[PDB]
Design a protein around this ligand. Structure first.
Ligand SMILES: CC(F)(F)[C@H]1OC(N)=N[C@](C)(c2cc(NC(=O)c3cnc(OCF)cn3)ccc2F)[C@H]1F
Length: 381
């Protein structure tokens, strides 16, 4: 309940993700590693790509073992290619342990590493089913639990805000009660591949979208620290934006803004947060016919873009976007909440984050219980 050593072990920059310090090999080589609940490989830069502050030098490690197998990982945007091996891995500001983990030594990549970012690898925290090349490549967290007495859970407090610094905590093997207020509320992990969950109802400023709830999870809903946006299925996005436009009628904005094709800027600290509605996702609860509600503010979904050279004003991107891969509860969701990935009990806990950004009128919220019928029908098959 109190893991003081792990508090504040996350760093980052706006729009560049949250990383944790790790060591690989003997003697230990220090690397900054993106915390990613939306993938399942531990994959680290292993060659001098010019964007990289540093990289894993396998020749320097006496504990390195080669698996004599490569892996090619294409994405929608980018790609990486790597060579598989195992080595000793530890987390300096995490549990006092050392595990032998699979490592994909990245040897070629495209549109993967971020120019100007301070991380050199990715820690895939999701399950073996989506590991590359196949489910026999045991993910890091699985090895950690198998090889040690670290309990089968972790929790994330992602704290949003020159690119401004972000931070937070990754509590490995436990929960730190100072990181949230009120109660944790749990939603079932529907299936252990991604951190899959079921959205049961959507509200904009308390106004139900009245869609068939299956649309909310077409073809899945996931919790993903490695995605910035709240990503919504195309039809859900359309209805949500229509409703958000209606709720913020006080001012007009161009169509491009809602599509993330264009920024909107306001003069120095004069953001009309109050014209923008709250957004509420109801998640499947732990018991039959019971749900709970998570609520985020414009402070979560209207994200500052700091690196605009051509403007002297305060510029923002609408960080709700359309998706072909289902709902993605990215940083836009997770920055509102302390999120507990309770792998042992196949569930995910949400609580109001003690570090979430809000104003004097409105706060992010986690509330329940509510009575919701036919919640199983909301899952897609
Ligand atoms: C499916 C997908 F969208 F391509 C990616 O999504 C996830 N979850 N992880 C990967 C391995 C990834 C993730 C990132 N993530 C980020 O750069 C990032 C940036 N800002 C974030 O939050 C706001 F700070 C979160 N993640 C970068 C490169 C990447 F390759 C990809 F699989």
């Amino acid at each position: 309940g109190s893991f003081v050593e792990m508090v504040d072990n996350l760093r980052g920059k706006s729009g560049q993700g949250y990383y944790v310090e790790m060591t690989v090999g003997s003697p230990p080589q220090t690397l900054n590693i993106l915390v990613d609940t939306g993938s399942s490989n531990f994959a680290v830069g292993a060659a001098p790509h010019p964007f990289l502050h540093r990289y894993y030098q396998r020749q320097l490690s006496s504990t390195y073992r080669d698996l004599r197998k490569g892996v090619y990982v294409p994405y929608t945007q980018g790609k990486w290619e790597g060579e598989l091996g195992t080595d000793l891995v530890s987390i300096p500001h995490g549990p006092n342990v050392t595990v032998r983990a699979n490592i994909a030594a990245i040897t070629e990549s495209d549109k993967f590493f971020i120019n100007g970012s301070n991380w050199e690898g990715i820690l895939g925290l999701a399950y073996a089913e989506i590991a590359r090349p196949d489910d026999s490549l045991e993910p890091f967290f699985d090895s950690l639990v198998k090889q040690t007495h670290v309990p089968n859970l972790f929790s994330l407090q992602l704290c949003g805000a020159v690119l401004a610094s972000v931070g937070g905590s990754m509590i490995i093997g436990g929960i730190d009660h100072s990181l949230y207020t009120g109660s944790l509320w749990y939603t079932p992990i529907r299936r252990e591949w991604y951190y899959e969950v079921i959205i049961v109802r959507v509200e904009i400023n308390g106004q139900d979208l009245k869609m068939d709830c299956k649309e909310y999870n077409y073809d899945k809903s996931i919790v993903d620290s490695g995605t910035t946006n709240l990503r919504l299925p195309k039809k859900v996005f359309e209805a949500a934006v229509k409703s958000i436009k209606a709720a913020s009628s006080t001012e007009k904005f161009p169509d491009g803004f809602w599509l993330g094709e264009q920024l909107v800027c306001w003069q120095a600290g004069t953001t009309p947060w109050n014209i923008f509605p709250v957004i509420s996702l109801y998640l499947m609860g732990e018991v039959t016919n019971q749900s709970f509600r998570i609520t985020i503010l414009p402070q979560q979904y209207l994200r500052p873009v700091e690196d605009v050279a051509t403007s002297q004003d305060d510029c923002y991107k609408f960080a709700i976007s359309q998706s072909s891969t289902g709902t993605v509860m990215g940083a836009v969701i997770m920055e509102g909440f302390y999120v507990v990935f309770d792998r042992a009990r196949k569930r995910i806990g949400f609580a109001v984050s003690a570090c979430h950004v809000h104003d004097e009128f409105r706060t992010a919220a986690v509330e329940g219980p509510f009575v919701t019928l036919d919640m199983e029908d909301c899952g897609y098959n």
